[PDB]
Design a binder for this molecule. Structure first.
Ligand code: MG
Ligand code: MG
Ligand code: MG
Ligand code: MG
Ligand code: MG
Ligand code: MG
Ligand code: MG
Ligand code: MG
Ligand code: MG
Ligand code: MG
Ligand code: MG
Ligand code: MG
Ligand code: MG
Ligand code: MG
Ligand code: MG
Ligand code: MG
Ligand code: MG
Ligand code: MG
Ligand code: MG
Ligand code: MG
Ligand code: MG
Ligand code: MG
Ligand code: MG
Ligand code: MG
Ligand code: MG
Ligand code: MG
Ligand code: MG
Lengths: 129, 88, 70, 104, 271, 66
RNA sequence: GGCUCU
RNA sequence: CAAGCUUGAGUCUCGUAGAGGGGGGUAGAAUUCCAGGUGUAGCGGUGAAAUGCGUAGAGAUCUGGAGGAAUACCGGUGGCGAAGGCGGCCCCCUGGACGAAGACUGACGCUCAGGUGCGAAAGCGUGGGGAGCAAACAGGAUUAGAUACCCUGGUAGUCCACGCCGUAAACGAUGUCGACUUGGAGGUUGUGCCCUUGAGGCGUGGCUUCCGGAGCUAACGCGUUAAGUCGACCGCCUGGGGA
């Protein structure tokens, strides 16, 4: 069954990049929106857009640099079978700081670097590199 | 299978709208009718294992539907099993 | 294969027609098929190899029709 | 109810008794609140192969809308009648009424 | 229903009952009873003619219609009863005119069914009609050999006779033994198999269960003296001789049929 | 090329003998669908109708049994 | 037709 | 925890396909047996032979009868089923799938230790049945031998009912459920539309076969029905023997 939408989101991104797809659509959510907000801000996708009213469809415009893909690697960390929570000291550095770790905190979803500057940790959603 | 008139007789008996056809009591009573109709079939045909699989599917579906009704509203569950003569 | 010799018909003609009709209806190969018992494993195996021979030979004939040899 | 197609094959020496059988079977159906849709005597007809050491038979086609109980009675009547040689009942989805291509 | 008994005692260890719950749990119909005095296998000379017979439970005789002459008149089946005189269950039937009779119970017969004898009878299990009126290939029982004499064939619990042919005055039968026999085509027969087919599935378990049935013990012949039996004698277990009767007749294989009167009625013997 | 697809019949009648004789061989065998080009739905209906006409002695089971 | 070992 | 929503799941309506199952009937061809007619010296079998059947009249042929079992052609990398597996025709009872439009319920779902159920053939038990085939066995050959392959026979068994066994290279040697990811040629089964201006033209669903791209893989190869990219749960592995 569809037990996990966030890994479905990441997988549709990953396969879109490998297929050289321009845009990727999926059923929207409040969290999938907050993550695409982060991925646009950090520069991995160009733009996101949610359309529709009763069942909204989130469309992501992917980003390609020099022909090849921007998102080299994207991985799910916390899963329904195994949740991962970290403190602010034990936040990870993806690719020695080059990649990011999308973290859900009490003050919303942010990157790991802003979580450290905020002085608070949370749930590690994904490693994006 | 179950006949069309018996279906509509159940739907109009236990449906709030006589057209809902998908309510929980409607699906339960339609299952209970086909099960009790097939008690005579499998009493005569005990080697129809392939049909018994469809029967056990009906039983398991009725049990899941009942358990949803139980935790959704108990009084409808009590009124239902009282009307259908169900042990559980 | 009930064959009546027609009026003013040569015998080698009617005999060749009778061999023709027996080869058409497939009698000799039927008896050769029924002289011994063949298991349903062997029957499913012979039918699968018959389909693969039909098919790889259809694609090989069509692939060699296109390209040249010298 | 359940639309049936009944065809039976009579001993040709009992060709005279055919309308007595047909009238009894029809009064069985309508007495059982059945309908009768088509009814085609085909007469004596040369068999494709000799049944019961004989070469001809009298055919009767019948399209019927009856309950299945009187049809099982009719089958037992065909079973114990020695006049009827073969009987074939074939269930049909609907009532057919057009004449057969061989009554023609 | 066969019922294996639990081994609370030896003698119940191997007992299989045959329980039929439809039988009447009461006294039989009194007008149809008569006295059946035991014999002991002894003739008018008092000598034992047939051995091993003696004792057993007292048994009243049930008058059974085998001739089956109430023609045209339908009869409903009142109840099924036990008959100790025979292996098959019997049925108490009630005619319309008020006459009650006992018949042999067929297989599928139950209380409340209608039977009817005669030529104009239908063909269902229970009816009795002549085999020139019975279709070829059917299973009948209680078959007459002579017309009006009464049924003599296929009276035991699970038996039946197939009708394989008919040539005018005769029908050819396939007896339960495998013998093919000619019978006149005017002899009555009763449709269906006889009832208690699982009778042979019983196990008596113990010796007393045979003594209840009047079967005295059988002494095998080599356990005797030579004056008593041909097999008798020996210093140890010795049997150097061919198996015979007590009267010196070969048993293993030797035929004993000597009726040249009925050989024309026998199509093929049993095999 | 299929006649039943062209004529558009919902069910083949076993009683149409001149058709079924245009689809059986001389020895009463059922002509395969490779040759006549019959769609396999109608080929199944045709075999199911021929077996009925054989039961009714409208068609032979073979040419010899005579 | 079958016709072992090294 | 409370209230929901409809996309998941399910119910309803009308249809379609199907060797899906159980039960009961029935037909035709052939085999053998039995009786009989004509007929007369071989038959049958093999690499070659012999055992075997035959003048007591076989084999061949014709007529009639019995009985059992399986259902040529259709027939097809065709179909159905959870798997095992399912093949004449008809009826009764019966399960599931799919499609079209709508309507309804509103997360009711996925997986599953233990458990329960089904589960080829062989085998067991009781009761029947018993044509053909055929372990065993017997005889003949072959051979150095031949407890074998070959031949002539032939019993359990194969068949039916009810119970038991609970295994197979029970294999796709690939657990179930769900999501995404370039294509091509087909098969089958629905369905919409275009003037069907012909059997055509354009689509849209289900199932299925072959090739093959990226990618994967030790390689072989898989390749939208994944052995690709991911998620949920279960089962299992840890050197070869011994086992
Ligand atoms: Mg349904
Ligand atoms: Mg004695
Ligand atoms: Mg004794
Ligand atoms: Mg003794
Ligand atoms: Mg002594
Ligand atoms: Mg002496
Ligand atoms: Mg001694
Ligand atoms: Mg001695
Ligand atoms: Mg060597
Ligand atoms: Mg050596
Ligand atoms: Mg809606
Ligand atoms: Mg609503
Ligand atoms: Mg499961
Ligand atoms: Mg388990
Ligand atoms: Mg077996
Ligand atoms: Mg057995
Ligand atoms: Mg047995
Ligand atoms: Mg035998
Ligand atoms: Mg052999
Ligand atoms: Mg295993
Ligand atoms: Mg298998
Ligand atoms: Mg396999
Ligand atoms: Mg495995
Ligand atoms: Mg490939
Ligand atoms: Mg991998
Ligand atoms: Mg996979
Ligand atoms: Mg692998």
């Amino acid at each position: 069954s569809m037990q996990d939408p966030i890994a479905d989101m990441l997988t549709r991104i990953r396969n879109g990049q490998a297929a050289n797809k321009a845009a990727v659509t999926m059923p929207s959510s409040k969290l999938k929106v907050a993550i695409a907000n982060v991925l646009k801000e950090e520069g991995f996708i160009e733009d996101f857009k949610v359309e529709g009213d009763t069942k909204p469809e989130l469309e992501l415009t992917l980003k390609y640099f020099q022909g090849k893909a921007v998102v080299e690697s994207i991985q799910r960390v916390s899963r329904p079978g195994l949740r991962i929570y970290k403190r602010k000291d034990e936040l990870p550095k993806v690719m020695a700081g080059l990649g990011i770790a999308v973290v859900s905190t009490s003050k919303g979803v942010m990157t790991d670097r802003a979580a450290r500057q905020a002085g608070l940790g949370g749930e590690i959603i994904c490693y994006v590199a | 299978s179950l006949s069309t008139e018996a279906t509509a007789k159940i739907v109009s008996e236990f449906g709030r709208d006589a057209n809902d056809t998908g309510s929980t009591e409607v699906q339960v009573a339609l299952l209970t009718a086909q099960i009790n109709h097939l008690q005579g079939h499998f009493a005569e045909h005990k080697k129809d294992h392939h049909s018994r699989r469809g029967l056990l599917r009906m039983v398991s579906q009725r049990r899941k539907l009942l358990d949803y009704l139980k935790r959704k509203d108990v009084a409808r569950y009590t009124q239902l099993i009282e009307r259908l003569g169900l042990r559980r | 294969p009930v064959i009546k010799v027609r009026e003013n018909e040569p015998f080698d003609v009617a005999l060749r027609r009778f061999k023709r009709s027996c080869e058409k209806a497939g009698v000799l190969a039927e008896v050769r098929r029924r002289e011994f018992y063949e298991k349903p494993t062997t029957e499913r195996k012979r039918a699968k190899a018959s389909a693969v021979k039909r098919h790889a030979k259809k694609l090989a004939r069509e692939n060699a029709r296109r390209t040249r040899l010298y | 109810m359940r639309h049936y197609e009944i065809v039976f094959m009579v001993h040709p020496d009992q060709s005279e008794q055919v309308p007595g059988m047909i009238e009894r079977y029809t009064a069985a159906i309508t007495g059982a609140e059945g309908k009768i849709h088509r009814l085609e005597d085909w007469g004596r007809r040369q068999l494709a192969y000799p049944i019961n050491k004989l070469h001809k038979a009298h055919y009767v086609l019948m399209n019927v809308e009856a309950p299945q109980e009187v049809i099982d009675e009719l089958e037992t009547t065909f079973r114990f009648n020695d006049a009827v040689i073969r009987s074939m009942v074939m269930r049909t989805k609907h009532a057919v009424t057009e004449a057969s291509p061989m009554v023609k | 229903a066969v019922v294996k008994c639990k081994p609370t005692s030896p003698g119940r260890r191997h007992v299989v009952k045959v329980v039929n719950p439809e039988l009447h749990k009461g006294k039989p119909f009194a007008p149809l009873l008569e006295k059946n005095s035991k014999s002991g296998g002894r003739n008018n000379n008092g000598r034992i003619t047939t051995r091993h017979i003696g004792g057993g439970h007292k048994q009243a005789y049930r008058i059974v219609d085998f001739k089956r002459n109430k023609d045209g008149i339908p009869a409903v089946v009142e109840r099924l009863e036990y008959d100790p005189n025979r292996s098959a269950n019997i049925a108490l039937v009630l005619y319309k005119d008020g006459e009650r009779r006992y018949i042999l119970a067929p297989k599928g017969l139950k209380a409340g069914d209608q039977i009817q004898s005669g030529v104009d009878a239908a063909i269902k299990p229970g009816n009795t009609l002549p085999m020139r009126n019975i279709p070829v290939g059917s299973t009948v029982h209680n078959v007459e050999m002579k017309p009006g004499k009464g049924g003599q064939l296929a009276r035991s619990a699970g038996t039946y006779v197939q009708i394989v042919a008919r040539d005018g005055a005769y029908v050819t039968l396939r007896l339960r033994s495998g013998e093919m026999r000619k019978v006149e085509a005017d002899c009555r027969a009763t449709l269906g198999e006889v009832g208690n087919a699982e009778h042979m599935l019983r196990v008596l378990g113990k010796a007393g269960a045979a003594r209840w049935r009047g079967v005295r013990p059988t002494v095998r012949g080599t356990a005797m003296n030579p004056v008593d039996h041909p097999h008798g004698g020996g210093e140890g277990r010795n049997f150097g001789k061919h198996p015979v009767t007590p009267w010196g007749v070969q048993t293993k294989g030797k035929k004993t049929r000597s009726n040249k009167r009925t050989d024309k009625f026998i199509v093929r013997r049993r095999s | 090329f299929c006649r039943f697809t062209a004529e558009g019949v919902q069910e083949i009648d076993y009683k149409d003998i001149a058709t079924l004789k245009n689809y059986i061989t001389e020895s009463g065998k059922i002509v395969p669908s490779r040759i006549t080009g019959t769609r396999a739905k109608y080929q199944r209906q045709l075999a199911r109708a021929i077996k009925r006409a054989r039961y009714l002695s409208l068609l032979p089971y073979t040419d010899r049994h005579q």
